Design a protein around this ligand. Structure first.
Ligand code: MG
Ligand code: MG
Ligand code: MG
Ligand code: MG
Ligand code: MG
Ligand code: MG
Ligand code: MG
Ligand code: MG
Ligand code: MG
Ligand code: MG
Ligand code: MG
Ligand code: ZN
Lengths: 137, 195, 74, 177, 50, 71
RNA sequence: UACCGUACUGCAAACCGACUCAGGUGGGCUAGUAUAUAUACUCAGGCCAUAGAAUCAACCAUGUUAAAGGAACUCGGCAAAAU
């Protein structure tokens, strides 16, 4: 459903003049955008969970407006705080994705370097034993 | 199977000391015209990490089987006497035991009749081998006393912040740590243990 | 889905150099999503690969080069 | 303002000293990874002196030499090359492991440009000279090197026949422990 | 204090000062507009567009 | 710190003597490709010379060597 | 369940200063050693394009160190040093 080289920033995309989409425009700047596919209930970004779409966030709004009856003093300020929370959560999903991918890549390169050194040492030992063996012969 | 010369001879090489990988022994007056790389490579051999992990595990299991304060001499002899198979020198065993103590896997106590001020590194130490890795390094009674002092200091700072126009504790915004990477990493972990 | 566009600016330099500037008439672009007419619905017409492998391959991919400058030769 | 050229010392290369040492470490790592690099004359001369120091440190082959080169030399793919291929290649060479050929000026700033390459390799531009030159025992030099305390210093294979009678022995193997 | 930057742009203030309606609100603003017409200016006010 | 009069064409020419370049009395010319450079500089194909045909170096045979390629 | 905004930039080479101007420009979010949004190193992320190349001029700017003294300098310990 996503073209991940474009998502990580290493490939060109559909509508290449955008280069920084908002919450909407992720769906249409995707290079793998299929028009025949149905349109999701919430139209989320990547970097968020698969359960983040098909889940209305206004249940949170009504829930914390109902059980706390003193949030009804300034309702417009409350709605502004909720919308600010929504954008902030979309940013925190991106930050968590970036930290997870970086921490994966660190140990992958850290393993591959030791594998390369093991290959180099096991290649040197063969040459050294070859020299001493031909000195024997 | 993991047995290597020291380059001095008359010993075997522990993981972390120079080996001798030349196939035939040559004396140093004789080897004077040969490049030094053709006897010992100057780099670690890429198996000393795994052997060091195995040797530390055997040192812990020997300390675990005998639940007695067990100084470096008998833990070296105890690891050696289970099958010169392992632990060629006391210095390697001391290096392993101090690393295990620094990672809170074992701890140290004074040695009677050879105290030598126990903070002096020449002092022989008694190893107890606590069962789980501790979150902190000190005696748990002293850690509890320090936690009570720190908790009272936290209450005092909060009260002083209340006399001034501030919150008792710093109020921080709650964050979101879940993402697509963590969900997919969970799926990979569940399939990996599932197989 | 409708998008409002400005006209394109046009430059048509004159017999004496003036920089005559024009502007096309503003237009609206509509994105119309259609639906299959009657009984013909088969023409929506579209193995697997793990998305963990997709992200791990797209993280070890080489980066896009920085954009060259219009005077720069590469 | 301290005098570096005219009073034999390291070049400044328009840089602070920590930047200067880091740039030389990067260039010596690049010089041994690709055996011929092209740069300005001042960096080329400084690279030639640094290459002689680093190559001799690799020729020692000791654990302290490996530890010192581990900080000096960045790649680690090429730390192996310095201690194995370069050390065996120049095992008997008394310095001068690198040559410099001037190559004109570069387009961006008209700075003089020199080619710096390792000698005695397939793909070098001038034939090397042998590091040693076996002496005639019936010439004046050999007798001067007998009356005065000089060694023979003859050309040698990697393992001479003087170790053959030790390595042939089946009681001097120890089975590999 | 460096000078020269007296023009702080704002669309609300620009339209509210030099727009058509404040020019038409007063008589002398209407003769300002009338002599702009008599001069022959292509742009009558700062907010005119089509 | 300011000229009091206008410099004449003769005085300007006399003052501009430092700006002129000296002619070089030697050149190294490749007989094949007709290239031109200093006698201390390589000017073959490895350096900038799109006209090089390799005839500038007339002999280069070096087949034998033996070493450990580190891989 | 319509209409308008949605590109790009936004401490800045894209705004206000004639400039690719060392100036001015509002609000919000944030990881570790660690402990404060201060301080040193670092995470995520970003950057090392807008003159380059060597070298020992004098001199200028900004600093480091200095033997024995110590305001004797100077309109004035100004400036530095010092706590
Ligand atoms: Mg719209
Ligand atoms: Mg100077
Ligand atoms: Mg520094
Ligand atoms: Mg101010
Ligand atoms: Mg003005
Ligand atoms: Mg600023
Ligand atoms: Mg100005
Ligand atoms: Mg500016
Ligand atoms: Mg830093
Ligand atoms: Mg620059
Ligand atoms: Mg003094
Ligand atoms: Zn030619």
């Amino acid at each position: 459903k996503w073209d991940w080289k474009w998502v990580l920033g290493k490939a060109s995309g559909r509508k290449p003049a955008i280069t920084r989409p908002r919450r909407h425009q992720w769906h249409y700047c995707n290079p793998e955008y299929d028009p025949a596919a149905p349109l999701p209930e919430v139209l989320r970004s990547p970097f968020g969970p698969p359960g983040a779409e098909r889940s209305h966030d206004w249940a949170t709004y009504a829930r914390h407006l109902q059980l706390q009856p003193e949030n009804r003093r300034d309702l417009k300020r409350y709605r502004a705080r909720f919308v600010r929370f929504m954008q902030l959560r979309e940013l925190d999903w991106r930050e968590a994705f970036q930290r997870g991918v970086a921490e994966d890549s660190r140990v992958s390169n850290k393993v591959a370097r030791a594998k390369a050194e093991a290959q180099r040492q096991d290649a040197w030992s063969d040459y050294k034993q070859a020299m001493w063996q031909r000195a024997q012969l | 199977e993991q047995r290597h010369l020291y380059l001095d001879g008359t010993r075997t090489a522990d993981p972390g000391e120079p080996r001798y990988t030349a196939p035939y022994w040559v004396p140093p007056s004789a080897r004077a015209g040969i490049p030094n790389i053709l006897f010992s490579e100057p780099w670690p051999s890429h198996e000393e990490p795994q052997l060091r992990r195995q040797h530390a595990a055997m040192c812990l299991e020997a300390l675990k089987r005998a639940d007695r304060p067990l100084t470096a001499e008998q833990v070296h002899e105890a690891v050696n006497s289970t099958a010169k198979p392992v632990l060629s020198t006391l210095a390697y065993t001391k290096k392993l035991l101090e690393h295990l103590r620094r990672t809170r896997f074992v701890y140290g106590r004074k040695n009677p009749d050879s105290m030598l001020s126990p903070g002096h590194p020449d002092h022989p130490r008694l190893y107890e081998a606590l069962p789980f890795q501790a979150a902190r390094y000190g005696k748990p009674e002293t850690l509890a006393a320090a936690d009570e002092a720190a908790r009272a200091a936290a209450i005092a700072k909060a009260q002083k912040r209340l006399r001034n126009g501030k919150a008792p504790y710093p109020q921080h915004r709650r964050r979101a740590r879940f993402s697509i990477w963590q969900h997919e990493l969970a799926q990979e972990a569940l399939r990996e243990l599932q197989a | 889905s409708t998008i409002n566009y400005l006209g394109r600016r046009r430059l048509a330099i004159s017999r004496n150099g003036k920089r005559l500037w024009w502007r096309e008439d503003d237009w609206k672009k509509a994105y119309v999503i259609f639906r299959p007419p009657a009984g013909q619905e088969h023409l929506l017409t579209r193995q697997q690969r793990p998305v963990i492998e997709q992200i791990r391959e797209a993280a070890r991919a080489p980066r896009l080069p920085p954009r060259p400058y219009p005077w720069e030769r590469r | 303002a301290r005098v570096r050229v005219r009073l034999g010392d390291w070049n400044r290369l328009n840089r602070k000293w920590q930047h200067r040492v880091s740039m030389m470490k990067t260039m010596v790592t690049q010089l041994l990874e690709k055996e011929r690099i092209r740069t300005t004359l001042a960096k080329a001369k400084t690279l030639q002196r640094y290459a002689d120091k680093v190559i001799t440190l690799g020729k020692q082959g000791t654990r302290e030499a490996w530890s010192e080169a581990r900080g000096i030399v960045r790649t680690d793919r090429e730390l192996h090359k310095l201690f194995t291929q370069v050390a065996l290649r120049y095992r008997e060479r008394p310095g001068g492991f690198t040559r410099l050929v001037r190559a004109g000026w570069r387009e961006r700033d008209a700075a003089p440009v020199a080619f710096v390459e390792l000698v005695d390799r397939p793909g070098e531009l001038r034939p090397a000279n042998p590091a040693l030159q076996r002496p005639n025992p019936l010439s004046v030099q050999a007798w001067i090197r007998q009356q005065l305390g000089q060694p023979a210093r003859e050309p040698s294979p990697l393992l001479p026949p003087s170790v053959q009678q030790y390595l042939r022995e089946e009681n001097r193997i120890q089975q590999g422990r | 204090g460096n000078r020269g930057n007296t023009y702080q742009p704002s669309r609300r203030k620009r339209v509210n000062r030099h727009g058509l309606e404040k020019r038409l609100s007063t008589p002398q603003g209407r003769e300002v507009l009338l002599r702009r017409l008599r001069k022959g200016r292509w742009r009558i006010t700062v907010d005119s567009f089509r | 710190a300011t000229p009091k009069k206008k410099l004449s064409l003769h005085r300007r020419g006399n003052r501009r003597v430092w700006y002129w370049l000296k002619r070089k009395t030697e050149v190294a010319k490749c007989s094949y490709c007709g290239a031109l450079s200093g006698r201390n500089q390589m000017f073959s194909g490895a350096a900038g010379n799109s006209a090089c045909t390799g005839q500038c170096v007339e002999q280069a045979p070096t087949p034998p060597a033996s070493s450990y390629p580190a891989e």
